[PDB]
Design an enzyme around this catalytic site. Structure first.
Site, PDB file in Angstrom:
ATOM      1  N   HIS A 132       0.805  -1.216  -0.149  1.00  0.00           N
ATOM      2  CA  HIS A 132       0.005  -0.006   0.172  1.00  0.00           C
ATOM      3  C   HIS A 132       1.020   1.411  -0.390  1.00  0.00           C
ATOM      4  O   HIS A 132       2.296   1.490   0.398  1.00  0.00           O
ATOM      5  CB  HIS A 132      -1.151   0.155   1.482  1.00  0.00           C
ATOM      6  CG  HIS A 132      -2.128  -0.899   1.463  1.00  0.00           C
ATOM      7  ND1 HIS A 132      -2.775  -0.847  -0.198  1.00  0.00           N
ATOM      8  CD2 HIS A 132      -2.397  -1.747   2.190  1.00  0.00           C
ATOM      9  CE1 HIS A 132      -4.056  -2.170   0.307  1.00  0.00           C
ATOM     10  NE2 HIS A 132      -3.269  -2.279   1.385  1.00  0.00           N
ATOM     11  N   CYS A 161       0.066   2.542  -4.207  1.00  0.00           N
ATOM     12  CA  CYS A 161      -0.550   3.830  -4.250  1.00  0.00           C
ATOM     13  C   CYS A 161      -0.028   4.709  -4.192  1.00  0.00           C
ATOM     14  O   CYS A 161       0.876   5.008  -2.981  1.00  0.00           O
ATOM     15  CB  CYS A 161      -2.151   4.216  -3.830  1.00  0.00           C
ATOM     16  SG  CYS A 161      -3.280   2.187  -4.479  1.00  0.00           S
TER      17      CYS A 161
END
Lengths: 93, 140, 4, 93, 139, 4
Positions: free
Chosen positions: B88, B130
């Site tokens: 992430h 991301c």
């Protein structure tokens, strides 16, 4: 005789700043899928920027998101290469 | 004189950080599919000639120390170095299981003055994560 | 698809 | 059939994020000097990343700052190429 | 594998050459930038770009320059180029009156905001500081 | 040698 301490770095981001990155739970993330596919086929014969440029194209054309949530439906993605390299890079010979 | 010198004993080290599970407090969910990523990357870079090592579900401290030690190793006989991050993320930062850490801090270990044995050698970082919440709707 |  | 809105951009920064960029009052900035010299010799025959990579090398090697102020004395610089391109780019044909 | 370059024009090249600055910004003169701008002009002209040099632009002007450029018809152009020469800080570039985000300047040429440059390369060359750090080098 |  000196060389910049920040020189000779390359960053291959899966996406551009401010944006999300797509991952398929069954097939893996888009960027990695494309990266591996092209490396398998051209890792030995193409220069690193040629490879990542083709990776950019593959992610941009071949992929489009699907989701029941409309917010993440039919979305697109473009990766992001940051190069501080001073030479061309070939992984062979 | 326009290409990196690839005439070394080994091509180099390839470190893969495969973060799949995260502490609930981070608010991050499971990253299903990352295992197939980590594998494909492994098979690919091993095939290229890299000495590949895969690390899984690392904390921020683990990731920092891992890369720190790698930069302190002797890369004199290596053509280059590669590192792949699967986790992430948000802008300028990457998630460990424990939370976020700046990407610049991870890569700074390999700066020319901080890793002299990789001087004038390419340092590659592949980042699957991301970098914010925006989405690209596309066109045409 | 999911996001990272 | 769709294309990402952020695709097909290229940013050729004179330097990396967080860092300054050097300018010679009599000769011009380092980055522009190198860019023009390389373009003059190879603008038509080299791919854009090959061009900018050589620019990176030229700025990193051929240049080192001179200054009475020690804070700005004998400093170095490396430029920063950001590519969202999906193809190779030649300025000819 | 290559961008299609078979067009009537290579494309437009906008050069913004900011040398002098409004005292309120506290930024000094950028001596040498004129020699950059001219050298750049000849180079990109030689490449085949239709080059126009704008000097000492305000933030509003720079925004307007690029906005107008993105609204033009690039159907017969292979690509677009823009060169920025000014003072800067991270993520921002100086106009005469102050700073403006680089993201705002370039966003005008997004695929959904400039259909005639779709699938065409959009190049931005930026000579400007991005912070205050310096690189001491090594060896 | 000035900076930008």
């Amino acid at each position: 005789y000196k060389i910049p301490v920040e020189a000779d770095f390359l960053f291959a981001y899966s996406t551009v700043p401010g944006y999300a990155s797509m991952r398929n739970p069954g097939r893996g993330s888009w960027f990695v899928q494309a990266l591996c596919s092209i490396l398998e086929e051209h890792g030995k014969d193409l220069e690193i920027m040629q490879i990542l440029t083709r990776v950019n194209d593959r992610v941009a054309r071949h992929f489009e998101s699907q989701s029941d949530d409309p917010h993440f439906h039919e979305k697109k993605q473009i990766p992001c290469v940051v190069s501080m390299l001073t030479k061309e890079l070939y992984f062979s010979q | 004189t326009y290409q990196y010198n690839m005439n070394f004993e080994k091509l180099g080290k390839c470190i893969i950080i495969n973060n799949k599970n995260f502490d609930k407090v981070t608010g991050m969910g499971v990253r299903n599919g990352t295992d197939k990523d980590a594998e494909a990357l492994f098979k690919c870079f091993r095939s290229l000639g890299f000495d590949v090592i895969v690390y899984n579900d690392c904390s921020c401290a683990k990731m920092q120390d891992l890369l720190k030690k790698a930069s302190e190793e002797d890369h004199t006989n290596a053509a280059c170095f590669a590192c792949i991050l699967l986790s992430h993320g948000e802008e300028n930062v990457i998630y460990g299981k424990d939370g976020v850490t700046p990407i610049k801090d991870l890569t700074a270990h390999f700066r020319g003055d901080r890793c002299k044995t990789l001087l004038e050698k390419p340092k590659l970082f592949f980042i699957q994560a991301c970098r914010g919440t925006e989405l690209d709707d596309g066109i045409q | 698809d999911e996001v990272x």
